[PDB]
Design a protein around this ligand. Structure first.
Ligand SMILES: Nc1ncnc2c1ncn2[C@@H]1O[C@H](COP(=O)(O)OP(=O)(O)O)[C@@H](O)[C@H]1O
Ligand SMILES: Nc1ncnc2c1ncn2[C@@H]1O[C@H](COP(=O)(O)OP(=O)(O)O)[C@@H](O)[C@H]1O
Lengths: 296, 296
């Protein structure tokens, strides 16, 4: 009763898709192992003793429990957690654990849940650990590709497979941003003009995915005037880099609530763009769209 | 030396697609004839006396001048118009004349302009006549099917052809709402949550069209809380009607600024739905998605 699997990072928001859009990455990823023990305890082994190891406080511990209850495994569990990336950087670090955790269980013991259900319980973890469902990082972690959380209370997720090559460059500033503090600057109200702008550009991005038009997808992604102009201020040199790689990327925007940045470099400039990101920030990752948590 | 065209009515907004979405109807439509005449003058005749004949006021005369001017055409034109529906009903009556004229001029004088440019020209009629360059009704009138105006300067239109069966029922109350009236009902600001809600649902409608899922398309269409709740109050029996056809349609909402109502009846209830609308509004018409202006 052992399961080893990869739970990938994800990038939520993608500019105009704030709180709806999610893109699953191939890397980084949390490598998680969950062997089924006999006793009734929840044991957490997580490198970087910065991640709460107490089952009720750790995200994977929360998902883990609530799922055994509902499926009455009457067993406890030990969790081997190899962190793919630092929390508070905007790459769905936590979401990776939740979805990784939930997918494990289901794969393991003959359970035959729905990817949507897994996304559901997994949210329990981002919710029971942050007070919000946030299926937007969890949904792509599970479905892979591109996802849209179009409804909560109940939960609905629309999935669009990315069948073409989409190169992705990620830069991770050695800075931390309080996900919460950057909520209050987030306006409580918006003008009709922005409703119209964001609805149009986001819809245009769905159209771009169906037409495999990366240029159109990336350009509309960078059209938000509501959240990005505010959140961007906290990211050192973000606006300057955007302008600098302007003609060398299909698009570049903040990943989740930041400070991590996600860019879609043009084939002809992947090396150069990756270098520019390395000079400003120091940590850069070259990846592409992933297919979500899969048994390793 | 003349051309005659059928220019369709159109339905904009479609609930959560305010100022973005547009659906072309097959009927009603304007029948417009344009004849190249020798004196450099613009003569306009119409069968609706509540509509101007002054070339600088009739939307058709405004579009024709702008094009004749830009292309330095030597001739003048006689425009004869048979109206499909009254203005002020939310069915894009003015747009039908504007799009129809731009399309007819382009045919008569062999300008070979692409559809996007004909929508841009048709847009002057909408502006020069109603103060704002709006293209969400002229876009579907020129392109047919479903359109998204995703940028206004420069103008950008994304077209999604509808190749599956989509029955439409239109109820036209004997009331009118002009452009100043339309603006009056509009909220000053929108909450962040509504923005997120409309972005998600509008994006789901696009996903629905690519997946030919009429149930999903209609359901998300009925999700707006920003404008429909206020606008519906202006239409006698609207909420009551919506409730009455509740499980017999894929969706029902207001057409454009209203007061007309657009419904997408489920195939097994089309006659029953048409009769219910008809009990409330005599001027009810059955139609389907149109292909845009066409030479007749
Ligand atoms: N398995 C886990 N992986 C990562 N972070 C966890 C986990 N379990 C609990 N946490 C804690 O929850 C908090 C989550 O921060 P968070 O805003 O969710 O990061 P992120 O925005 O990358 O998803 C952190 O303080 C972290 O220590
Ligand atoms: N060819 C035309 N067809 C329809 N309306 C026109 C035309 N030329 C000018 N107008 C005027 O412009 C105004 C447009 O009202 P409007 O809100 O644009 O109707 P609609 O919303 O159906 O397009 C009316 O007062 C109308 O008389």
């Amino acid at each position: 009763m052992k399961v080893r699997v990869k739970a990938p990072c994800t990038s939520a928001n993608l500019g105009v898709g704030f709180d709806v859009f999610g893109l699953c990455l191939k890397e980084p990823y949390d490598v998680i192992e969950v062997e089924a023990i006999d006793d009734k305890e929840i044991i957490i082994e997580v490198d970087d003793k910065n991640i709460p190891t107490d089952p009720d406080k750790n995200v994977a511990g929360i998902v883990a429990k609530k799922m055994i209850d509902d499926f009455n495994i009457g067993k406890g569990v030990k969790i081997t957690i190899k962190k793919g990336v630092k929390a508070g950087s905007g790459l769905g670090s936590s979401a990776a654990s939740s979805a990784g955790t939930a997918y494990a269980i289901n794969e393991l013991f003959k359970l035959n849940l729905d990817k949507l259900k897994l996304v559901d319980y997994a949210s329990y973890g981002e919710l029971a650990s942050s007070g919000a469902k946030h299926a937007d990082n969890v949904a792509p972690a599970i479905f892979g590709g591109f996802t849209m959380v179009t409804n909560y209370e109940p939960l609905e997720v629309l999935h669009i497979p990315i069948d073409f090559k989409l190169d992705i460059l990620i830069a991770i500033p050695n800075i931390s941003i309080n996900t919460k503090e950057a909520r209050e600057i987030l306006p409580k109200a918006v003008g009709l003009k922005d409703l119209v702008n964001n609805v149009g550009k986001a819809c245009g991005m769905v159209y771009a995915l169906y037409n495999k038009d990366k240029s159109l997808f990336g350009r509309y992604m960078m059209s938000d005037k509501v959240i990005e102009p505010v959140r961007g201020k906290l990211i050192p040199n973000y606006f300057k880099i955007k302008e600098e790689v302007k003609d060398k990327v299909y698009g570049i925007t903040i990943s989740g609530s930041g400070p991590s940045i996600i860019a879609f470099p043009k084939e002809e400039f992947i090396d150069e763009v990756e270098n520019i990101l390395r000079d400003y920030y120091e940590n850069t990752i070259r990846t592409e769209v992933g297919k979500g948590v899969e048994v390793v």
